[PDB]
């Protein structure tokens, strides 16, 4: 799971607004979230994975074990159940809440970390590179 380890900075964002729309994120947060260029810091300690996201918007962190469901408060303040798994080199996170769910796929593409977020057919894609 070490291919993801390191510090990553956002270099491109696509369709993030309609992904957020689909998730139920409100207008004001969408403006601030869409203007942020977060760093994403990923580390592994033994079996424990950690992902820190650092924007002007918010600073969040999740710590989790692969394939063990955990409770999470997302940056837009949803309380979700998440499970994160490693699937052929992609880190795949499923978040469930209030009868909905969204998949967040983190994968390595050349020198890039590509994050694909899907919910109900709406996809957002954010690309990161090492800082």
Residue 2: phi and psi, rounded to 5, are -80, -10
Q: Work out how close the CB of 107 gets to ligand HNE at its nearest, in angstroms, rounded to a whole number.
A: 12
Regarding 15 and contact with ligand HNE (CB under 6 A), the answer is: no
Q: Does the annotation list 126 as a binding residue?
A: yes
Q: Show Cβ contacts of residue 99 under 8 Å, excluding neighbours closer than 6 positions.
A: none
- Judged by CB under 8 A, the residue of 50, 101, 123, 125 near a second copy is 50
- Closest to ligand HNE by CB, 18 or 76: 76
- Distance, CA of 22 to CA of 31 (rounded, Å): 15
Per the CB < 8 A criterion, the answer to whether 70 and 82 are in contact is: yes
Q: Is 19 annotated as a binding residue?
A: no
- Pick from 55, 88, 82: nearest CA to 66: 82
* Comparison of 24 and 89: residue with beta carbon closer to ligand HNE: 24
- The count of chain residues that interact with ligand HNE, using the rule CB under 6 A, is 11
Stretch that binds Cl ion, among 14-22, 27-35, 58-66, 103-111 (CB under 5 A): 103-111
Burial class of 40 by CB neighbour count within 10 A (0 to 12, 13 to 18, 19+) = buried
As annotated, the binding site for a fatty acid includes 126-128
State the residues that interact with ligand HNE by CB under 6 A.
20, 23, 25, 33, 74-76, 104, 115, 117, 126
């Amino acid at each position: 799971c070490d291919a993801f380890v390191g510090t990553w900075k956002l270099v491109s964002s696509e369709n993030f607004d309609d992904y957020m729309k689909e998730v139920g994120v409100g207008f004001a947060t969408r403006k601030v979230a869409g203007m942020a260029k977060p760093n994403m810091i990923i580390s592994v300690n033994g079996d424990l994975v950690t992902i820190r996201s650092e924007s002007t918007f918010k600073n969040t962190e999740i710590s989790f074990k692969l394939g063990v469901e955990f409770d999470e408060i997302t940056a837009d303040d949803r309380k979700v159940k998440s499970i994160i798994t490693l699937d052929g080199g992609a880190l795949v996170q499923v978040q469930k809440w209030d009868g909905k769910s969204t998949t967040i796929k983190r994968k390595r593409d050349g020198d890039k970390l590509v994050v694909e977020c899907v919910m109900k057919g709406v996809t957002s894609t954010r690309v990161y590179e090492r800082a």
